[PDB]
Amino acid sequence: SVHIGAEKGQIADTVLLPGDPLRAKFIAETYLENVECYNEVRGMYGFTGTYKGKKISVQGTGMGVPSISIYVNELIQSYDVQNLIRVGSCGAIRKDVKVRDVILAMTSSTDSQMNRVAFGSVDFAPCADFELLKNAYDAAKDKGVPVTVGSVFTADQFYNDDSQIEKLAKYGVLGVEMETTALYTLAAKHGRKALSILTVSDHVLTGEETTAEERQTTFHDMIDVALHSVS
Amino acid sequence: SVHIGAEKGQIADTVLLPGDPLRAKFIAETYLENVECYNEVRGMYGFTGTYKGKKISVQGTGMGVPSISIYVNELIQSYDVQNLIRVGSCGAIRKDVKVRDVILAMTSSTDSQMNRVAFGSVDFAPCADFELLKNAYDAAKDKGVPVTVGSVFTADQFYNDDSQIEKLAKYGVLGVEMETTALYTLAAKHGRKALSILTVSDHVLTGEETTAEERQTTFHDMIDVALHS
Amino acid sequence: SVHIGAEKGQIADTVLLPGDPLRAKFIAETYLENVECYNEVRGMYGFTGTYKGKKISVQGTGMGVPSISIYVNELIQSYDVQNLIRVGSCGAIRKDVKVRDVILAMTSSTDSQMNRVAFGSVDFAPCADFELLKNAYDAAKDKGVPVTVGSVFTADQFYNDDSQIEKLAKYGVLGVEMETTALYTLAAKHGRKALSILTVSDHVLTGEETTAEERQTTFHDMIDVALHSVS
Amino acid sequence: SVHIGAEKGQIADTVLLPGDPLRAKFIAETYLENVECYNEVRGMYGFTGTYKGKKISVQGTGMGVPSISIYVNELIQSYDVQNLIRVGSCGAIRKDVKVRDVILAMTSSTDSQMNRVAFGSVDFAPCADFELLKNAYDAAKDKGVPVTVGSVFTADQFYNDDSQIEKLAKYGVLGVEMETTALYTLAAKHGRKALSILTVSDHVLTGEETTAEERQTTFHDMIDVALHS
Amino acid sequence: SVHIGAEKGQIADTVLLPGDPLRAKFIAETYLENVECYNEVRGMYGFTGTYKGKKISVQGTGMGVPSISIYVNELIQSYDVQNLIRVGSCGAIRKDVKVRDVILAMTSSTDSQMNRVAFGSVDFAPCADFELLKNAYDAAKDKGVPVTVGSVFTADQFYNDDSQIEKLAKYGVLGVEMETTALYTLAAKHGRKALSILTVSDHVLTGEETTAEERQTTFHDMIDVALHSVS
Amino acid sequence: SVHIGAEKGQIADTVLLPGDPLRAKFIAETYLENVECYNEVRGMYGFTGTYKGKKISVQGTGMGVPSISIYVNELIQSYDVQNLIRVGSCGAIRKDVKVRDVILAMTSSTDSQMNRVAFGSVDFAPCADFELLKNAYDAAKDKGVPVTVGSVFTADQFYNDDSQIEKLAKYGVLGVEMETTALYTLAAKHGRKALSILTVSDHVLTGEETTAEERQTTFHDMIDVALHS
Ligand SMILES: Nc1nc(F)nc2c1ncn2[C@@H]1O[C@H](CO)[C@@H](O)[C@H]1O
Ligand SMILES: Nc1nc(F)nc2c1ncn2[C@@H]1O[C@H](CO)[C@@H](O)[C@H]1O
Ligand SMILES: Nc1nc(F)nc2c1ncn2[C@@H]1O[C@H](CO)[C@@H](O)[C@H]1O
Ligand SMILES: Nc1nc(F)nc2c1ncn2[C@@H]1O[C@H](CO)[C@@H](O)[C@H]1O
Ligand SMILES: Nc1nc(F)nc2c1ncn2[C@@H]1O[C@H](CO)[C@@H](O)[C@H]1O
Ligand SMILES: Nc1nc(F)nc2c1ncn2[C@@H]1O[C@H](CO)[C@@H](O)[C@H]1O
């Protein structure tokens, strides 16, 4: 394909999709065996290894709906990827989402226009694949990793002047990131399975920041949950 | 309250919400013990009885977003209802939705302006309360009731000359009905729990019908699942 | 049809369309002779009688644009109904609309999306059928029943957080209910005649409520006017 | 005011509003006595004369919503005009609108953003002042001038590559022109009375023309009706 | 055509398009030789003369997007006009646009719906023809006529209640008039060349008015620049 | 700042903004002397060096409006960057855009909601800083680098099932890419100067490719022009 430099076969059925190519590299080297770099196009790294003798690829997506839209589409159409699990971070916008919680996005809201372009007068609500979602839930509970399930917001603009997250906070929406809507929409469009697992980077509404050691513990929890979600 | 004739204490914490008031009476009379009809205003009946020791209210909502919104707001605001579970039907829009599958809605797309009216340039995806959803999932699996989880479309025009269900089918959307988005949006706004459980009434894009026997079977399943959410 | 349980012929040319099925029953029993219930589907009652030896049906519509849209469509497509007269109540939003006035809606505004779904960049303005409107006007004046003619608003949400009725009040709009737009739009679409006759339930903008005896006198006036509108 | 060169008292309570300033002079000179041209700014002429004892002003508005809006705002705000009656033409979009029918607009649909700019997610249906409308109806019937009442479409692009008049015809809409929604929306905002009276210039969807004799006849009818509203 | 009363040939390749028909007449009589009126339809005058022995027409457009849209379309489709240069005035909305500056509109913003009707979910940005724009720039600098290049706003409503020019002022937008968007969009649509040259009528945001003698000097500068823009 | 690891003073007044960070390193290493990589956060590299006595920073932005917006906001807000010039490629959508033509964007249309989110019912046309544009034009003409000036389309879906480039081609639009509107809108908001210079990567509506030799040639041209804006 155009944005991915793999050959036939270099990419597994199941892909983790972190935002940051350097987290992709870090995840591949830390949790996966017999690792290969199959893509260095644009510095957006893709690696394939094995976890408990199952093939698993890890492809950085970049930030924003357009970036992930390109890689999801090309992972699906050109490499027949079946399961797409995003593993990133979001900004918590409610007091009750706690800094160690691992979030499983059931659906996403958005101020992207990608779906108004498609459906016009329809509000399209992207849906996670429940099968994936459920395995991710049970893998969390099993170990007793704390976990929260609900909706997120897919922002188009990180530094938003007209930010309505204060309203979305009052409808139960959990946090803001910039990718989920695009993942779920394209996955669904193509008959593939998708889920987003998010850790809390900060609390947006009180400025309050997570420490580097909490972030590091929840990240581990996230990747680990993810790794037992398929089947 | 303006559309519900009940006093304090007549309405349960937990309320089932069929569209049809005669299905509400049906549910109340068949499955609940010690039943009182608490509302006859507009012939939109509501009943309260008990099921395994626990008060369960059953309330007709009528058809469409505006209608269910009036009832859900009043149930929430005037009667401090905590759990709101819609039990109804929907037109299957995909072949892999089979006539017997009980659907649980994670979320719902809509052509309703209700949320654009609230949010401007945000698409608000309404969300089911996951605990209720999991409980309903668990209860279906525990009995072996066939169950599919995913999304519906909450339509405003049952008869839609510019229907976009042909495209919504291509994005995974399971079926079409007329209330869910209202219920899920208003429940969350007021910090209450909501879930929609739905049986198939027809296959819309093959026009094809489900028999009265299939519907009776699937409607029972749907009640028995609900009663354990 | 699907939502109406009549046979061929049980429904007249002319239908009154009140919101409340129990007002449908009350109207049928009070003003009409030789009454039959032809529909009990969903508790949404339809009756047919005769008034001064002319056939007239009365079908509850339910509340909101979707509910009425279903019954209007099925009254038109499956029973070839020619005249559709809605007879309900609205909330008065201007001081100069008085509690005894019977309102004849010439057009309606709306925050329903039913017409943006249809026309997109077009603002569609539903229009009453003037012939009906005029007969309704002359039947009012004739008796000296007080009557006001103008536009209404068809709300989607009864308990609206973002309510703009304060602005619509400054453009001359008379009151808010939840059905007119849908009636006029579908009627027009199918080449049928439509009109909405409304009584004032309350004044929305000062909380001020009508008494049960005023409501009862204007309701009579409304139905009576309606009953002499066709031809 | 910025676009009208008149002093206090030169402009009537009642003002006719043709699109074309040469039709304004035509109306003023043919039907009114004791006529003064009160405005020549931008060659958009306005005249005042008398008809049966009563001052009648006649003012060109130009073409389009933006144009008529400037004039109508200024007539209202600077000159306390009470009655504003547009007299013009429109393209018939339906077969049952005949070339001789004088149209009175109850309301108007539009592709103009003017009202969405004011109201967000509301469709504002502009409304005619019913008294003026009834008076014009009565005057047409009293003489036997053929008259049709219903809705028009106020377009922004006379030449519209994405024209939706084919669909608006299916919803009853009688004809297409370019001002009415502006007039009806601004009149009501400021608590004044407005009405549009319109003759047919062509049948747009059969392309077909009306003869110069038909138009002259229908234009006279239209004036004589107006002069009694 | 319908709104223009010329014959074959009466209109030149290049047209000046002022808002005011009486400015069209004034421009024709003051700067052009061997003048003919070729259109008096609607009092919207069109004249053709010669400037330094080149043919040039001057056609009043009227005010607002619809008015100019009609004449541009008919100048293009029925008279094969190649270059369309608008020569009007705008309201300056930033302090740094000065009362003698001649503005060359590179692009326009708008609250007209003409382009949302066409493209829907697309924001269409009309573009000036650079060739014209560049000649107009060089003709200004050459003489040392002071000149500013940027974007304008094409208002639909002169007396706007919900006016957002305070926001457009913060994005660098220079001034407001009511025609440019329509000109550039139709010109572009048909493969023709277009540019808008504007003088400052007032400063909108401080009420501050230009004097009748400044207006008269910049108007001269505008027409003169325009007259050396083609080729 | 959150996405750029630079200290005070490491970033130039003037910053080139290719989409691809490996093209950023390429630009920095080939054309600049005395080069330091000031950022490796997210592997979105930024370099600073000198070109004819003058600091020039080169910064990867990634793909899409959201991505370039983060970088441009931070470059502006945290590093007081004055000149922001995007150097990249775009799919030619018209036949009269030839493979060698260097495009300068006057403006950009978009399907991005970013500006509707800011402005409601206004279409905001983002504008290039004309001085930068003229300077780039002049530098292209001074060398005889083929140059076309006009508009692009800033897309959000590279793969767009409901693509409207077939219509945008008919209105003059030269090519399609994914950043420009963000850059031009954010630069102007904060009173800084911006310009987009773009080479052709393919002809989208004839599907047809440009050879690796053509792209290398046009990419060099594009850099050499930029370096004199
Ligand atoms: N508070 C936050 N707000 C937004 F809009 N995005 C956040 C936030 N925290 C983390 N992210 C994730 O990190 C990247 C942006 O830095 C994006 O890739 C995004 O997914
Ligand atoms: N095929 C169907 N399409 C739509 F739009 N709604 C359906 C369908 N089947 C059942 N329903 C549900 O029943 C009521 C409609 O009679 C509505 O309340 C709706 O919820
Ligand atoms: N103040 C009011 N506001 C709204 F939105 N609707 C009103 C009001 N008063 C009466 N109605 C009519 O009564 C029913 C809703 O109770 C609906 O059927 C509606 O037609
Ligand atoms: N067929 C027609 N279509 C449209 F859109 N407008 C029409 C038509 N006929 C007459 N008009 C009226 O006359 C002027 C247009 O020349 C406009 O002012 C308009 O009001
Ligand atoms: N301040 C201003 N605001 C707006 F909206 N338009 C202005 C302004 N100044 C001059 N114009 C130009 O003059 C005419 C309107 O009087 C229109 O033709 C328009 O082009
Ligand atoms: N044909 C093309 N279509 C679109 F939408 N974008 C294009 C194209 N060619 C190059 N680009 C630019 O390169 C990146 C996409 O790989 C994006 O950053 C984009 O700017």
Domains of chain A: 1-231 (3.40.50.1580)
CA A110 to CA F58: how far, in whole Å?
32
Which residue from E43, E64, E155 is facing D22, i.e. has the nearest CB?
E43
DSSP state, residue D166 = H
CA A231 to CA E124: how far, in whole Å?
47
| B5, HSE (Cβ side, Cα atoms, 13 Å) | 12
CA F112 to CA C142: how far, in whole Å?
59
3-state SS string over chain A?
CCCCCCCCCCCCCEEEECCCHHHHHHHHHHHCEEEEEEECHHHCCEEEEECCCCEEEEECCCCCHHHHHHHHHHHHHCCCCCEEEEEEEEEECCCCCCCCCEEEEEEEEECCCHHHHHHCCCECCCECCHHHHHHHHHHHHHHCCCEEEEEEEECCCCCCCCCCHHHHHHHCCCEEECCHHHHHHHHHHCCCEEEEEEEEEEECCCCCECCHHHHHHHHHHHHHHHHCCCC
What are the chain D neighbours of E160 within 8 Å (beta carbons)?
Answer: 117
List active site positions of D: 202
**How far away is chain D from the Cα of E182, in angstroms, using its nearest Cα?**
10
Are the C-beta atoms of residues E183 and E194 closer than 8 Å to each other? yes
> Angle, nearest 10°, between helix axes A21-31 and A212-227?
70
Helix (H, G, I), strand (E, B) or coil at C85: strand
CA C187 to CA C228: how far, in whole Å?
20
Output the CA torsion A112→A115→A117→A118 (10° steps): 170
- Alpha-carbon distance values, E150 to E64, E111, E176, F59 (Å): 21, 18, 12, 27
CA E42 to ligand 4: nearest atom: 16
Which residues 6+ apart lie within 8 Å of B73 measured at CB? B186, C158, C159
Nearest by Cα to D68 from E63, E49, E42:
E63
Q: Do F109 and E123 touch (CB under 8 A)?
A: yes
Are the C-beta atoms of residues C181 and C126 closer than 8 Å to each other? yes
DSSP state, residue C12 = -
Instruction: Name the H helices within C19-62.
Output: 21-31
Residue E88 Cβ contacting ligand 5 at under 6 Å: yes
The number of residues in chain B equals: 229
Residue D208 Cβ contacting ligand 4 at under 6 Å: no
Terminal-to-terminal C-alpha distance of chain C: 28
- Alpha-carbon distance values, B127 to A88, B111, C111, F45 (Å): 21, 16, 23, 39
DSSP-derived pairing of the beta strands C102-110 and C193-203: antiparallel
DSSP state, residue C170 = G
Q: Which amino acid is at A226?
A: A
- E window 43-72, beta carbon within 8 A of D: 43-45, 60, 62-67, 69-70
> Considering just the CA atoms, what is the radius of gyration of chain E in Å?
17
Are the C-beta atoms of residues C211 and C125 closer than 8 Å to each other? no
Nearest by Cα to E103 from E210, E221, E198:
E198
- Breaks in chain C after residues, C-to-N cutoff 2.5 Å: none
Q: Do F62 and A65 touch (CB under 8 A)?
A: no
Chains that touch B (3 or more CB pairs under 8 A): A, C, D, F
Are the C-beta atoms of residues D140 and D100 closer than 8 Å to each other? no
CB atoms near residue B182 (< 10 Å): 32
Residue A221 Cβ contacting ligand 1 at under 6 Å: no
Terminal-to-terminal C-alpha distance of chain B: 27
Tokens at A78, concatenated:
């050109």
Nearest by Cα to C164 from D123, E167, E156:
D123
Which residue from E121, E167, E188 is facing F171, i.e. has the nearest CB?
E188
Are the C-beta atoms of residues F126 and F185 closer than 8 Å to each other? yes
CA A45 to CA A183: how far, in whole Å?
18
Tokens at D72, concatenated:
């109508």
Evaluate whether chains A and E are touching (3 or more beta carbon pairs less than 8 Å apart): yes
DSSP-derived pairing of the beta strands E147-154 and E102-110: parallel
- D131 annotated among ligand-binding-site residues: no
CA B128 to CA B133: how far, in whole Å?
7
CA A215 to CA A199: how far, in whole Å?
8
CA C109 to CA E172: how far, in whole Å?
37
Q: Which amino acid is at F153?
A: F
Distance B125 CA to ligand 2 centre (A): 20
> Considering just the CA atoms, what is the radius of gyration of chain D in Å?
17
DSSP-derived pairing of the beta strands E83-92 and E14-17: parallel
CB atoms near residue A174 (< 10 Å): 27
Judged by a CB distance cut-off of 8 A, whether residue D120 touches chain B is: yes
CA F5 to CA B102: how far, in whole Å?
53
CA D116 to CA B113: how far, in whole Å?
14
Closest residue to atom 7 of ligand 1, CA basis: A177
Question: A52: burial class by Cβ within 10 Å (0-12, 13-18, 19+)?
Answer: exposed
CA A85 to CA A136: how far, in whole Å?
10
- Alpha-carbon distance values, B37 to B48, B224, E98, F183 (Å): 7, 21, 76, 63
**B146-149: which pairs have CB atoms within 8 A and are 24 or more residues apart?**
B146/B98, B146/B100, B146/B101, B146/B102, B147/B101, B147/B102, B147/B103, B147/B104, B147/B225, B148/B97, B148/B101, B148/B102, B148/B103, B148/B104, B148/B174, B149/A130, B149/B103, B149/B104, B149/B106
What value, to the nearest 5°, has the Cα angle with vertex B25 and ends B66 and C66?
A: 20
CA C219 to CA C24: how far, in whole Å?
12
CA F141 to CA E68: how far, in whole Å?
35
Judged by a CB distance cut-off of 8 A, whether residue F121 touches chain D is: yes
Selected residue of C2, C123, C159, C186 to mutate for chain B interface (largest B Cβ count, 10 A): C159
CA C23 to CA B179: how far, in whole Å?
25
CB atoms near residue B54 (< 10 Å): 11
What are the chain B neighbours of A172 within 8 Å (beta carbons)?
Answer: 127, 188-189, 191
Instruction: Name the H helices within chain E.
Output: 21-31, 65-77, 114-119, 130-143, 165-168, 180-189, 212-227
- Alpha-carbon distance values, E22 to D41, D225, E29, E43 (Å): 8, 33, 11, 9
Give the number of beta-carbon pairs within 8 Å between C and E: 5
- Which residues are registered as beta bridge partners of F48? F36, F57
Where b means 16+ CB within 10 Å and e means fewer, E6-30 reads: beeebbbbbbbbbbbbbbbbbbbee
Place of tokens 């590093």: F79
Are the C-beta atoms of residues A178 and A152 closer than 8 Å to each other? no
Q: Do F67 and A67 touch (CB under 8 A)?
A: yes
Nearest by Cα to F179 from F67, F58, F31:
F67
CA A176 to CA A50: how far, in whole Å?
31
- Which residues are registered as beta bridge partners of E127? E107
CA D38 to CA D57: how far, in whole Å?
9
Listing DSSP states for chain B in one string gives -TT----TTSS-SEEE--S-HHHHHHHHHHH-EEEEEEE-GGG--EEEEEETTEEEEEE---SSHHHHHHHHHHHHHHH---EEEEEEEEEE-STTS-TTPEEEEEEEEE--SHHHHHHTT-B---B--HHHHHHHHHHHHHHT--EEEEEEEE-S-SS-TT--HHHHHHTT--EEESSHHHHHHHHHHTT-EEEEEEEEEEESSS--B--HHHHHHHHHHHHHHHTT-
DSSP state, residue E43 = G
Output the CA torsion A165→A171→A176→A179 (10° steps): -120
CA E186 to CA E193: how far, in whole Å?
10
Q: Which amino acid is at A231?
A: S
User: Can you say whether the dihedral through the CA atoms of A148, A153, A159, A161 is positive or negative?
Assistant: negative
Listing DSSP states for D100-161 in one string gives TPEEEEEEEEE--SHHHHHHTT-B---B--HHHHHHHHHHHHHHT--EEEEEEEE-S-SS-T
Which residues 6+ apart lie within 8 Å of D229 measured at CB? D83, D85, D132, D135, D136, D139, D195, D197
Judged by a CB distance cut-off of 8 A, whether residue C82 touches chain B is: no
Chains that touch A (3 or more CB pairs under 8 A): B, C, E, F
Are the C-beta atoms of residues E125 and E222 closer than 8 Å to each other? no
Tokens at A16, concatenated:
């983790």
CB atoms near residue D41 (< 10 Å): 15
CA B184 to CA A172: how far, in whole Å?
10
CA C14 to CA C58: how far, in whole Å?
9
**Minimum-distance ligand to the CA of D198?**
4
CA C9 to CA C29: how far, in whole Å?
20
CB atoms near residue D77 (< 10 Å): 13
Judged by a CB distance cut-off of 8 A, whether residue E164 touches chain F is: yes
Nearest by Cα to B62 from B182, B174, B160, B161:
B182
Are the C-beta atoms of residues D14 and D28 closer than 8 Å to each other? no
Q: What residue of E is the nearest CA neighbor of F149?
A: E130
Question: F161: burial class by Cβ within 10 Å (0-12, 13-18, 19+)?
Answer: exposed
CA E104 to CA E139: how far, in whole Å?
12
Terminal-to-terminal C-alpha distance of chain F: 27
Tokens at D140, concatenated:
């047409």
Which residues 6+ apart lie within 8 Å of A123 measured at CB? A115, B109, B110, B111, B112, B115, B116, B123, B124, B125, B181
Residue E200 Cβ contacting ligand 5 at under 6 Å: no
Which residues 6+ apart lie within 8 Å of D96 measured at CB? none
Nearest by Cα to B151 from A124, A121, A65:
A124
| D193, HSE (Cβ side, Cα atoms, 13 Å) | 16
List active site positions of E: 202
Q: Do B123 and A130 touch (CB under 8 A)?
A: no
DSSP state, residue F104 = E
Q: Which amino acid is at C155?
A: A
Residue A135 Cβ contacting ligand 1 at under 6 Å: no
List active site positions of A: 202
Evaluate whether chains B and E are touching (3 or more beta carbon pairs less than 8 Å apart): no
Listing DSSP states for E13-30 in one string gives SEEEE-S-HHHHHHHHHH
Tokens at A105, concatenated:
């996005």
Known binding-site residues of E for phosphate equal: 19, 23, 42, 86-89
CA D168 to CA E62: how far, in whole Å?
28
Instruction: Name the H helices within E32-153.
Output: 65-77, 114-119, 130-143
Residue F62 Cβ contacting ligand 6 at under 6 Å: no
| C82, HSE (Cβ side, Cα atoms, 13 Å) | 10
Tokens at B136, concatenated:
């309903």
Question: E228: burial class by Cβ within 10 Å (0-12, 13-18, 19+)?
Answer: middle
The secondary structure of chain C in percent helix, strand, coil, rounded to multiples of 5, reads 35, 30, 35
Give the distance between the most distant pair of CA atoms in chain F: 49
Are the C-beta atoms of residues A55 and A13 closer than 8 Å to each other? yes
Residue D157 Cβ contacting ligand 4 at under 6 Å: no
Nearest by Cα to B123 from A93, A173, E118, E122:
A173
**Determination approach:** X-ray
3-state SS string over F12-62?
CCEEECCCCHHHHHHHHHHHCEEEEEEECHHHCCEEEEEECCEEEEEECCC
- Which residues are registered as beta bridge partners of E195? E85
DSSP-derived pairing of the beta strands C102-110 and C147-154: parallel
CB atoms near residue F27 (< 10 Å): 26
3-state SS string over F148-210?
EEEEEEECCCCCCCCCCHHHHHHCCCCEEECCHHHHHHHHHHCCCEEEEEEEEEEECCCCCEC
Torsions phi, psi of E60, nearest 5? -60, 140
DSSP-derived pairing of the beta strands C33-39 and C14-17: unpaired
Q: Which amino acid is at E120?
A: G
Give the distance between the most distant pair of CA atoms in chain C: 49
List active site positions of F: 202
Are the C-beta atoms of residues B194 and B84 closer than 8 Å to each other? yes
Which residues 6+ apart lie within 8 Å of F202 measured at CB? F91, F92, F208, F209, F210
Helix (H, G, I), strand (E, B) or coil at F70: helix
Place of tokens 């991505």: F67
Output the CA torsion C14→C20→C23→C28 (10° steps): 30
What are the chain F neighbours of E193 within 8 Å (beta carbons)?
Answer: none
CA E120 to CA D164: how far, in whole Å?
14
CA D70 to CA E156: how far, in whole Å?
10
Place of tokens 């046309």: F125
Are the C-beta atoms of residues E84 and F126 closer than 8 Å to each other? no
